[PDB]
Design an enzyme around this catalytic site. Structure first.
Site, short mmCIF file in Angstrom:
data_model
loop_
_atom_site.label_atom_id
_atom_site.label_comp_id
_atom_site.label_asym_id
_atom_site.label_seq_id
_atom_site.Cartn_x
_atom_site.Cartn_y
_atom_site.Cartn_z
CG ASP D 205 2.17 16.77 19.08
OD1 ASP D 205 1.77 15.70 18.57
OD2 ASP D 205 2.56 17.73 18.40
CE1 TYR D 262 -0.64 21.22 12.81
CE2 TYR D 262 -2.18 22.92 13.54
CZ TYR D 262 -1.67 21.63 13.63
OH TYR D 262 -2.19 20.74 14.53
N1 LIG Z 1 15.74 23.83 21.65
C1 LIG Z 1 14.55 24.67 21.81
N2 LIG Z 1 14.24 25.18 23.02
C2 LIG Z 1 13.15 25.95 23.17
N3 LIG Z 1 12.35 26.23 22.12
C3 LIG Z 1 12.62 25.72 20.90
C4 LIG Z 1 13.74 24.92 20.70
N4 LIG Z 1 13.76 24.57 19.40
C5 LIG Z 1 12.71 25.12 18.79
N5 LIG Z 1 12.01 25.82 19.70
C6 LIG Z 1 10.80 26.57 19.45
O1 LIG Z 1 9.76 25.71 18.96
C7 LIG Z 1 9.29 26.25 17.77
C8 LIG Z 1 8.95 25.19 16.86
O2 LIG Z 1 7.64 24.67 17.02
P1 LIG Z 1 7.16 23.36 16.21
O3 LIG Z 1 5.80 22.99 16.62
O4 LIG Z 1 7.15 23.65 14.74
O5 LIG Z 1 8.20 22.21 16.55
P2 LIG Z 1 7.79 20.70 16.79
O6 LIG Z 1 6.99 20.65 18.13
O7 LIG Z 1 9.07 19.92 16.98
O8 LIG Z 1 7.05 20.17 15.50
P3 LIG Z 1 5.79 19.39 15.37
O9 LIG Z 1 4.63 20.00 16.08
O10 LIG Z 1 5.47 19.35 13.91
O11 LIG Z 1 6.00 17.93 15.87
C9 LIG Z 1 10.43 27.10 17.26
O12 LIG Z 1 9.95 28.08 16.42
C10 LIG Z 1 10.98 27.65 18.45
O13 LIG Z 1 10.24 28.76 18.87
O1 LIG Z 2 -0.59 15.16 13.00
C1 LIG Z 2 -0.18 16.47 13.05
C2 LIG Z 2 0.28 17.02 14.35
O2 LIG Z 2 1.13 18.19 14.04
C3 LIG Z 2 1.05 19.32 14.84
O3 LIG Z 2 2.31 19.86 15.04
C4 LIG Z 2 0.24 19.29 16.13
O4 LIG Z 2 0.98 19.76 17.26
C5 LIG Z 2 -0.46 18.02 16.41
O5 LIG Z 2 -1.65 18.39 17.22
C6 LIG Z 2 -0.87 17.34 15.25
O6 LIG Z 2 -1.83 18.13 14.52
MG LIG Z 3 4.95 21.37 17.84
#
Ligand SMILES: Nc1ncnc2c1ncn2[C@@H]1O[C@H](COP(=O)(O)OP(=O)(O)OP(=O)(O)O)[C@@H](O)[C@H]1O
Ligand SMILES: OC[C@H]1O[C@H](O)[C@H](O)[C@@H](O)[C@H]1O
Ligand SMILES: [Mg+2]
Ligand SMILES: Nc1ncnc2c1ncn2[C@@H]1O[C@H](COP(=O)(O)OP(=O)(O)OP(=O)(O)O)[C@@H](O)[C@H]1O
Ligand SMILES: OC[C@H]1O[C@H](O)[C@H](O)[C@@H](O)[C@H]1O
Ligand SMILES: [Mg+2]
Lengths: 409, 514, 402, 516
Positions: D205, D262
């Site tokens: 990411d 996770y």
């Molecule tokens: N609009 C926002 N601004 C700042 N922080 C946020 C916001 N929305 C969510 N968050 C924070 O990010 C956290 C979520 O982390 P998460 O990694 O699960 O999201 P993601 O990066 O979108 O998902 P993923 O890694 O699976 O792609 C929330 O618990 C919260 O703390």
């Molecule tokens: O593919 C799954 C993806 O999901 C998570 O949220 C992580 O941030 C990434 O590093 C990767 O592990």
């Molecule tokens: Mg994330």
């Protein structure tokens, strides 16, 4: 050169502890001990046993008097249920005066069901004038002996503090459907405190060469009813009463050094998840010593001994470096082995193997000596300690037990 | 050749035979049914590498353990053990009517434990070949008389276990059951482990495969193998090795936690520290307590399979072996040369990439042990260099010719002297008496002088030209006057005679029928 | 809303606990808390601290009276030596009546040097009518909260038995030559029993939601004299007196389930060689939970929590350890957060009252002076039990019938 | 380009629009105009879920939603950061910076939105200390007023975009307007940033957010070095390639569920790697810079197996054919090793498979991040990883294939890879959910050729391969989803919410700074 002739009360080929321990020990020392006599209330049992074990030098005696009076016996071994010791040993001791050859009386721990019975038995035995032995075979464990050596030779310096944790095996939430009721009922001389704490705490005194000065105990019956289980561990849907204790808290001080000792004995299962079920942890000014056991009571189990320290067979060591020792005997059968080493010590004493120029005919107690074997006096002192554990619980008080090792009359 | 040889009626071997038969009779008031014989041994070179699976160069000598046996098939079956040396007191034990195995107490030094462990492995062997006869019923009883003229350091303990196992099989299978040399050697390999000594397989193999006037090349991997060979025939000289006893107080068992068993532990830890450092895994031996976590030969093989064109394990080829061992000695330098003071338990844990607790569980819990440091550098260097010297000795012994007789005595002698230096300074298993004997020998007719056996006492051997044109009598005289007369003034004519012996390679394990 | 304005007695930039713990906590919550006042007997200490920490909103007060009377303070924090708590807090409380804005009094544990002084302080604070806080910050350790969750939610079933082993750090055979004598002399409100056992045993009561029924204690001074050592651990050839304890044995029963509890607290070094120096082992009918710490007293230590048990019907294993967790700053910080959450009603509770008497075994809120008093009563009973040689019934000590 | 790009004006209209709105909100919040805006985009992963922390390559793209951090740099006697979020459910934070330049503590035991900012600030701080010791060692960072605004949906890599923007903002605020910030350094320092907040994630990411560009997807490789190679979707005859993103709207709680979800997954694949290594007698390297797999990962095993048993094989140097054969070998080894233990490994069985005690197993695998489990599904997790990696390589071939196919073949073949990936995430890795499964099914029956979750899963977002253009399926899919999923499970969604639940993005520019 003639074997010590042994008469058993309580050797049964089909059950009991003697068949598992005394008997195999004797086979290994067959020029030193021979079984010549058996007594059981049912003659059939003695006959069946003599047959099955092919005890070709043994006679089954029809009555206690005939057994106890017989001049074919040098050593009597009492291995019947503790609840029957007093009622057997007292008349036996009197009848045994008809036997000018009697040299040893060997009794299983516990000696009696109460201190009063222990005191009466001891007095009768001393009056009889025979060498006595109690089966506190933890004193003949190689692990205990090695620990005693390290401590006595200065390897941990002075003792700062001690923790002990044990498990009673049978006194948890569940009871196997085939387990006999008698070990779960008060007054039968067998329980978490008398038996299991008994062996373990005497082991501690022996290893450290100190009796206790002050003690406080709390005894629990938080499990008045156990759940019956089958052999696979499944609950059968039926409760049964347990009047003996399921937990013991004990704390006190060793006379030598006023050493703090903290003990907790869990009644039974569940076993601990993240910790050994038997642990003796000894902290010194100069090193530590720890004994741990995976399986079974201290007095019948293969242990591991860990040591690390310094005193800063002659080994050339560096002054500023800790010595590490691990002591474990992989193929050691402690169930047979500890009892076997006890018989060996009786044999050594009798035949004067070390050829010690002035070894007396008899001794009153082993106390903390390496040599010899524990007697009925060592047993009595342990009974006095157990009694004070129960009294301490009953009175809600810390007791001074500093004088229990002294005998007068 | 396949089976243990059987005899009925070496003018020396006949004299002993009758001598022991009468001692047996004097003890038990009946004649014995047979005598199990198993000889002592000396190792020419290759000390303390057998439990690392490296090949060695030993021979059986003219001193043996004799077990005269009367079979008693009358329950209650019992075994009575008498020794000709009254310091080993008579034992008697009844066989379990079960017939379960008898317990053995490995916590004490006890001469009968050696008999008991030979009996145990035999018993187990018997239950495997004849389950119906041996699973639920005891062995036969026996009256036994044990007589040995093997000096301490001459592999007495292993000769005893071999004779004991042999006797147990013969007494239970009968007069005409052929007993395999291969099987006898396999089952006795781990026998002493039951009595608290974590030894290798050299002494059992030697006692069993010995042959009159042949030495042996003994291999452990890829398979147990013992190849008899005669010393090279020289121009006008006789190759011989004289044995001198240090007379040092025997206590291998009591000192094992800091001596013999510590060494075995040190070489296992070293193999695993190497494997960790070079990112290879070692096999997990579940057959043998020597090294459940892998040994120094396992490391050599693992290193090569990873880094040298995925090489197959070393098959024992001399040339290849020298090459690989030279590499190993290099890796020992790179790995451990900066830690000559040794590894504390914490440092050894780190070197294996595990906790102190896990290290303790994996390496320190198999036999009792006591130490401040583990000397991985010195111990691994010894094993690899000693194994190297065996390969050099073998190619010499198997050469048909040499430039001169002197050349042989000097080259081979030098290998022995290097071995001694290594046992002394690196493995630290020599002693004052050993060191004194060797230096005297060398200054008076020996070409090579070294401890043999475990060390910390025991015996020493010396390469000396024998016969009318040799130095045997020069060496003997110099030792008697400069060593024995000095350190042990009171030795009797016979003792002195016994302290120094000249032996030809002797026949291996055998039975005498009565 | 406006930040809670904090007045400190005992915040010194050059030394002490507050600077290591309270201060960094406030920095992290600079919108919720502001330091507006300092008091120290030497005004120069306050001025220096104000300068060095750039405390732009703070004034150094010349007298205890002017500090305690000041309307610029919403919360007073007392972080001086326990031996000084009584002589400061009693007149402070009375002067504080001139401050209409006072809402919180925050005191470090131990509250006092004796139960009697603890009782007087509590009575004075209750009468003043402000919300009190005690620094039993072990109650805000994530490890303690997680254990409390597991226990309360039924993950170990009923509790069968408990063993505790702890270490007091300073009360072994040697004492650093730079170590201040006062922590080694009786009557100073700081010792193995009061401080270290206090924190740990309160933690246990909190995690199990139970006070004690019966207790017995043995208190030791087997080391009446300690050897002075240099910073490199070498003995300097001179002993000094230690009148406080070097060992504690404690055993008793939790009111809830009559649960056996066995405790041993070692005074100091040498540390144990084969066992962790801090262990809380909880054995239940359906599982076990064990907390271990290699470094530091429970209330400031990064621990590891181990759980195994059943609540398919198969065994669950849990390990809970936060590698980058700083418990010294962290637990105090979480205490400040809870004070702030209460004050600004951050969890939007429509009818959250303005004050509460005690936390007790509640997850929410924070420990008060009443929670402190109850712990003081237990500590007193430990010492009494030792003195009398008796197993005491302490089942009613959590009752304030006054 | 080597360094993070910097702009002062316009890029497609959309950027200046969102840019003006965040400047407005900043102004309304702080009553002053900000000095600069750190921007970092969200992402979707086309294929390769849950293999980045195993060091296998992935196929993601940055999308046109992002995290915007508008910053005003402050001149303060007491330096402090104030953090305000456009979404009021993320309450304002303010904290003072330690005056002696020491690092601020982070409490990894709670879920807190500002922890993502703090960990980004932490890794930047440590980076500043390395490049300018004599000026950052014992002096505090600069204060700031910050406004944070994201339209990245949960599951779009928001947490990483945020951490990347925070780290960027922190370097920019302290180094000034004229300091070049390299993409390489930024991706490196943020690699382990979330590990400070309790999440044991990989590097996909962060890398995507930083290396994104207009109209290019990325092939992201991790070994031997982080490498991101941009490529355009293939030019098709008369259809356009589009991926519709649909949000499950499942409640976000990755942190709270990490011990069973996770972080447990990460532990399972490390254990699986080491059980394989033990079974085949090879050693894995001992990672010392990253908490994913301190004891080695599944790619380490593949390498170590080949080094030991396949010395004669040709090397794998990013060659696809060779990569495929090595992965097929791994799949075989997984069958031989774990296929008889599909019920999973208890802690005791796992210890045995690793040839160690329970205690050592616990110390080595279970004490790095909080974890809770009944069994570890070594078979399923390792099978997913190796098969998912194989799917990435086949996908890559298609995206960069020379051999030509019909438009329909592309959609059908690429869709099939996505569908196989979804089935594996669902059944083998167990990181799908009901909502994900319903959306994917509806989508496939209503114009999608391939549908799968993206991101971590257990909720979050899904992606759907659809033709766009003159006669595309974008609107077909949207309406079917609205009618058949959203109206059904979330009847009370505002038109605004529905609009945002389903989007179509082109690949977008990576991380960048807007000055003034
Ligand atoms: N609009 C926002 N601004 C700042 N922080 C946020 C916001 N929305 C969510 N968050 C924070 O990010 C956290 C979520 O982390 P998460 O990694 O699960 O999201 P993601 O990066 O979108 O998902 P993923 O890694 O699976 O792609 C929330 O618990 C919260 O703390
Ligand atoms: O593919 C799954 C993806 O999901 C998570 O949220 C992580 O941030 C990434 O590093 C990767 O592990
Ligand atoms: Mg994330
Ligand atoms: N004459 C004997 N008969 C039976 N057992 C003996 C006799 N002499 C010694 N033993 C036993 O053998 C033990 C010695 O074993 P040890 O292995 O050290 O001797 P060794 O085999 O001669 O030496 P090494 O293995 O170094 O060659 C003694 O402790 C004793 O128990
Ligand atoms: O070379 C040493 C030698 O010494 C011991 O005594 C063992 O019996 C042998 O296995 C061998 O290890
Ligand atoms: Mg030997």
């Amino acid at each position: 050169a003639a074997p010590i002739r042994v008469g058993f009360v309580g050797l049964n080929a089909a059950k009991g502890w003697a068949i598992k321990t005394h008997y195999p020990a004797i086979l290994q020392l067959s020029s030193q001990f021979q079984i010549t006599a058996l007594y059981s209330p049912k003659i059939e049992t003695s006959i069946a046993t003599i047959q099955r074990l092919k005890l070709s030098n043994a006679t089954a005696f029809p009555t206690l008097e005939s057994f106890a009076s017989s001049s074919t016996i040098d050593m009597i071994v009492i291995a019947i249920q503790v609840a029957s010791h007093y009622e057997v040993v007292m008349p036996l001791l009197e009848f045994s005066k008809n036997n000018p050859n009697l040299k040893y009386l060997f009794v299983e721990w516990a000696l009696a069901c109460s201190l009063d019975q222990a005191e009466s038995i001891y007095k009768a035995a001393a009056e009889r004038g025979v060498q006595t032995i109690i089966s506190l075979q933890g004193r003949k464990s190689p692990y205990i002996l090695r620990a005693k050596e390290l401590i006595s030779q200065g390897y941990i310096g002075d003792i700062n503090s001690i923790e002990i944790a044990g498990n009673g095996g049978w006194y948890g939430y569940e009871r196997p459907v085939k387990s006999p009721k008698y070990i779960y009922e008060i007054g039968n001389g067998v329980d978490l405190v008398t038996t299991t704490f008994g062996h373990t705490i005497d082991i501690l005194q022996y290893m450290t060469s100190s009796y206790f000065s002050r003690i406080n105990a709390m005894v629990f019956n938080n499990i008045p009813e156990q759940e019956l289980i089958d052999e696979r561990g499944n609950r059968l849907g039926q409760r049964v009463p347990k009047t003996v204790p399921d937990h013991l808290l004990f704390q006190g001080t060793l006379l030598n050094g006023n050493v703090p000792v903290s003990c907790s004995f869990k009644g039974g299962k569940p076993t601990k998840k993240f910790t050994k079920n038997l642990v003796i942890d000894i902290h010194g000014t100069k090193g530590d010593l720890k004994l741990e056991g995976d399986a079974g009571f201290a007095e019948i189990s293969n242990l591991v001994l860990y040591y690390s320290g310094t005193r800063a067979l002659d080994p050339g060591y560096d002054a500023g470096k800790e010595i590490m020792e691990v002591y474990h005997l992989r193929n050691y059968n402690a169930i047979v082995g500890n009892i076997h080493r006890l018989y060996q010590s009786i044999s050594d004493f009798h035949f004067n193997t070390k050829k010690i120029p002035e070894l007396p005919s008899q001794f009153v107690m082993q106390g903390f000596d390496f040599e010899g074997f524990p007697t009925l006096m060592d047993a009595l002192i342990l009974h006095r300690l157990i009694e004070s554990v129960y009294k301490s619980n009953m009175m809600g008080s810390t007791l001074n037990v500093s004088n229990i090792s002294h005998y007068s009359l | 050749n396949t089976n243990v040889p059987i005899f009925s009626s070496p003018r020396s071997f006949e004299q002993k035979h009758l001598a022991v038969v009468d001692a047996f009779f004097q003890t038990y008031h009946v004649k014995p049914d047979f005598i199990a014989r198993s000889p002592g041994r000396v190792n020419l070179i290759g000390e303390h590498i057998d439990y690392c699976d490296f090949s060695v160069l030993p021979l059986a000598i003219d001193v043996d353990m004799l077990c005269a046996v009367k079979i008693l098939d009358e329950k209650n079956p019992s075994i009575t053990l008498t020794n000709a040396d009254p310091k080993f007191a008579q034992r008697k034990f009844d066989l379990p009517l079960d017939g379960s195995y008898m317990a053995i107490d490995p916590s004490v030094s006890e001469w009968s434990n050696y008999f008991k462990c030979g009996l145990h492995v035999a018993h187990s062997y018997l239950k495997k070949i004849a389950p119906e006869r041996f699973n639920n019923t005891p062995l036969v009883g026996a009256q036994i008389f044990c007589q040995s003229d093997i000096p301490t350091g001459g592999g007495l303990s292993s000769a005893f276990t071999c004779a004991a196992a042999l006797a147990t099989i013969r007494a239970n299978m009968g007069k005409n059951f052929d007993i395999s040399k291969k099987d006898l050697t396999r089952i006795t390999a781990v026998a002493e482990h039951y009595v608290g000594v974590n030894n290798g397989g050299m002494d059992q193999a030697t006692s069993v495969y010995g042959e009159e006037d042949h030495a042996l090349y003994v291999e452990f991997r890829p398979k147990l193998k013992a190849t008899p060979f005669k010393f090279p025939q020289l121009k006008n000289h006789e190759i011989s090795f004289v044995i001198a006893n240090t007379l040092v107080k025997s206590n291998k068992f009591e000192t094992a936690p800091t001596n013999y068993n510590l060494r075995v532990i040190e070489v296992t830890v070293a193999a695993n520290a190497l494997a960790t450092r070079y990112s290879v895994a070692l096999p997990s031996h579940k057959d043998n307590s020597n090294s459940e976590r892998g040994n120094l030969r396992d490391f050599m093989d693992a290193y090569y399979a990873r880094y040298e064109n995925q090489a197959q394990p070393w098959n024992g080829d001399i040339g290849t072996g020298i090459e690989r061992l030279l590499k190993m000695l290099q890796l020992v330098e790179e790995s451990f040369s900066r830690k000559k003071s040794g590894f504390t338990v914490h440092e050894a844990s780190t070197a294996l990439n595990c906790s102190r607790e896990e290290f303790t569980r994996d390496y320190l819990t198999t036999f009792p042990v006591r130490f401040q440091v583990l000397k991985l550098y010195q111990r691994a260097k010894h094993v690899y260099s000693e194994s190297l010297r065996v390969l050099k000795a073998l190619k010499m012994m198997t050469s048909a010719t040499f430039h001169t007789d002197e050349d042989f005595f000097t080259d081979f002698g030098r290998l022995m002297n290097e071995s001694q230096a290594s046992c002394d300074k690196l493995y630290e298993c020599s002693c004052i008496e050993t060191n004194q004997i060797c230096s005297i020998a060398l200054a008076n007719g020996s070409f090579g002088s070294r401890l043999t056996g475990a060390g910390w006492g025991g015996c020493t051997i010396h390469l000396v030209p024998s016969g009318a044109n040799g130095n045997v009598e020069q060496v003997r005289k110099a030792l008697i006057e400069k060593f024995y007369n000095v350190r042990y003034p009171d030795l009797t004519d016979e003792e002195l005679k016994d302290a120094i012996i000249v032996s030809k390679p002797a026949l291996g394990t055998c039975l005498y029928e009565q």
